[PDB]
Amino acid sequence: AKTITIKVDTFKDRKPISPYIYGTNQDLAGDENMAARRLGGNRMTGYNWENNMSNAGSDWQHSSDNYLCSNGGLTQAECEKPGAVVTSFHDQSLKLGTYSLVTLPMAGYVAADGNGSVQESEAAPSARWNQVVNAKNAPFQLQPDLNDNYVYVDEFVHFLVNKYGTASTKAGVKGYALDNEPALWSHTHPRIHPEKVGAKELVDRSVSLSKAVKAIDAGAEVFGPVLYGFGAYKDLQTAPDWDSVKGNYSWFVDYYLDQMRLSSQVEGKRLLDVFDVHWYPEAMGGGIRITNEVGNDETKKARMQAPRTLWDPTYKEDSWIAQWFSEFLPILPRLKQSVDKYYPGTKLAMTSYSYGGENDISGGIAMTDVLGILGKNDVYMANYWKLKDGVNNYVSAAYKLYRNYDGKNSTFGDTSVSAQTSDIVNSSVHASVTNSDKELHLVVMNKSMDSAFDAQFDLSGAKTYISGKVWGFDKNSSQIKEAAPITQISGNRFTYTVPPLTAYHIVLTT
Ligand SMILES: OC[C@H]1O[C@@H](O[C@H]2[C@H](O)[C@@H](O)[C@H](O[C@H]3[C@H](O)CNO[C@@H]3CO)O[C@@H]2CO)[C@H](O)[C@@H](O)[C@@H]1O
Numbered sequence: 436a437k438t439i440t441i442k443v444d445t446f447k448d449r450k451p452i453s454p455y456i457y458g459t460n461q462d463l464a465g466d467e468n469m470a471a472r473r474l475g476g477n478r479m480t481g482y483n484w485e486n487n488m489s490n491a492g493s494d495w496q497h498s499s500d501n502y503l504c505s506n507g508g509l510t511q512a513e514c515e516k517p518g519a520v521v522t523s524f525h526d527q528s529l530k531l532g533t534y535s536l537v538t539l540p541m542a543g544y545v546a547a548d549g550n551g552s553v554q555e556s557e558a559a560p561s562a563r564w565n566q567v568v569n570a571k572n573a574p575f576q577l578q579p580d581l582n583d584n585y586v587y588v589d590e591f592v593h594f595l596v597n598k599y600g601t602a603s604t605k606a607g608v609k610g611y612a613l614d615n616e617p618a619l620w621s622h623t624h625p626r627i628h629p630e631k632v633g634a635k636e637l638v639d640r641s642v643s644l645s646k647a648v649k650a651i652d653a654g655a656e657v658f659g660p661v662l663y664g665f666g667a668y669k670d671l672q673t674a675p676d677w678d679s680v681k682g683n684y685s686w687f688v689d690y691y692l693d694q695m696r697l698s699s700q701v702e703g704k705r706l707l708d709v710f711d712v713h714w715y716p717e718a719m720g721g722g723i724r725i726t727n728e729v730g731n732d733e734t735k736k737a738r739m740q741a742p743r744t745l746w747d748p749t750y751k752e753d754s755w756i757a758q759w760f761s762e763f764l765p766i767l768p769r770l771k772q773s774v775d776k777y778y779p780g781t782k783l784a785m786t787s788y789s790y791g792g793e794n795d796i797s798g799g800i801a802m803t804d805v806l807g808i809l810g811k812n813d814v815y816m817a818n819y820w821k822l823k824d825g826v827n828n829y830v831s832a833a834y835k836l837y838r839n840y841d842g843k844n845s846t847f848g849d850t851s852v853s854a855q856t857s858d859i860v861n862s863s864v865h866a867s868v869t870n871s872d873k874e875l876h877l878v879v880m881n882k883s884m885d886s887a888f889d890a891q892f893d894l895s896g897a898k899t900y901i902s903g904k905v906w907g908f909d910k911n912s913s914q915i916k917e918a919a920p921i922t923q924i925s926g927n928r929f930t931y932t933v934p935p936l937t938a939y940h941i942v943l944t945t
């Protein structure tokens with residue numbers, strides 16, 4: 436049996452953990468103790484707040500219908516109330532104590548009806564679509580005009596602020612996203628926006644929508660560009676006007692950060708608060724992309740390693756991204772580096788991502804690594820996305836390991852501290868205290884399909900630790916179970932065994 440050493444230092448690399456890394460798009464079981472919630476994805480592009488209609492685009496035969504009301508548990512009378520998909524979502528946020536992120540429309544049009552499929556000959560402008568206008572430039576109506584050809588976005592923000600107060604209030608909607616995957620508009624939403632979005636286009640639309648939002652609620656955080664994946668990060672999925680605008684910039688990311696900075700300077704307020712991406716791993720194992728299906732042993736191994744692509748300079752995943760564009764990986768430092776250069780101080784969010792294996796120990800383990808990684812790499816907000824319907828048991832386990840490990844919503848600490856391991860392949864470990872030094876939290880996991888290892892911990896810091904309790908989940912139980920205590924710790928050293936495919940949250944006490 437293998438021995439690994441883990442050195443934890445409470446003095447070293449102390450840094451605040453944004454709680455909004457514990458976030459989601461769809462609510463999961465309801466005991467994960469999320470801190471942030473997002474209403475976003477393909478369906479929100481064409482969502483019309485006046486009648487709650489929306490359009491599926493390429494996901495379901497370009498159907499305009501009441502899917503958001505029905506998926507959101509709304510009765511028909513509720514579906515008829517302006518704003519209801521969104522107010523029902525935000526009401527949930529308030530009950531749960533979460534941050535709300537609410538997507539706003541920017542592709543150009545929103546669903547005028549719920550009659551179903553919109554054919555290629557009915558693409559916008561057509562009786563099937565209402566036109567989006569950022570600034571109404573007229574007195575606002577809490578009950579919008581349902582009979583014209585327009586939906587006013589600043590009017591909807593005023594509706595939210597009238598009902599909830601401004602974002603700086605306790606009950607206010609705090610974040611707004613600038614549509615969703617705009618480099619896929621022409622693919623996902625051809626009936627709305629059939630041409631490939633341009634780089635400049637995207638900037639002008641972002642600036643104009645940010646301005647009308649901020650004129651209503653100067654406290655709201657505005658998130659953009661909500662890029663789907665690397666092809667968009669690189670060149671906005673071959674934008675037509677790229678070669679002409681690219682100049683010195685190394686990728687579209689720099690171009691958007693910089694141009695967002697410039698327009699903000701000219702306006703005299705920050706117009707981009709958060710740099711927003713989605714990240715669905717292209718990582719492969721046994722012929723299978725990890726996001727598509729659970730897969731074989733090799734798929735499951737590749738799922739458990741993939742989170743290293745986020746942070747680890749030494750790691751080369753099997754994917755086209757790592758093959759042709761390795762210079763842009765690991766991806767969080769790379770995005771950080773662009774932010775630092777082109778728009779200092781902009782926050783970073785991963786607003787829709789998933790590692791697959793939703794009901795496999797490999798997905799629970801992947802996620803438990805990822806949550807530790809996001810926390811200590813200056814990510815402000817992150818929001819899981821369900822690629823599979825029904826329950827996502829091991830994803831849910833991962834959150835609960837960090838946020839409700841004992842059934843009493845006890846959590847990881849708010850302060851990352853240095854934690855190192857001698858084996859980055861078979862193990863990962865993430866340490867935290869609270870800003871109360873009494874408790875040291877350690878999430879540790881064994882990624883091996885075969886071999887336990889004994890973890891030899893050495894702790895440095897202000898304090899001496901007497902004992903601890905342990906909680907975990909593994910391949911046979913997705914529910915977190917209390918595990919064997921560490922009844923005595925000699926000289927800030929102790930060994931605990933970590934069976935294969937197991938994740939533990941250890942709480943050491945003084
Ligand atoms: O399958 C039933 C419903 O699908 C709805 O569309 C969803 C797609 O199923 C889903 O793949 C898509 O996920 C995207 C995400 O929106 C943005 N990032 O990438 C993910 C993977 O491509 O999300 C869609 C909902 O937004 C469809 O709208 C319904 O009509 C169907 O009933």
Ligand SMILES: [Ca+2]
Binds near residue numbers: 581586
């Ligand atoms: Ca209208």
Ligand SMILES: [Cl-]
Binds near residue numbers: 661663
């Ligand atoms: Cl995109």
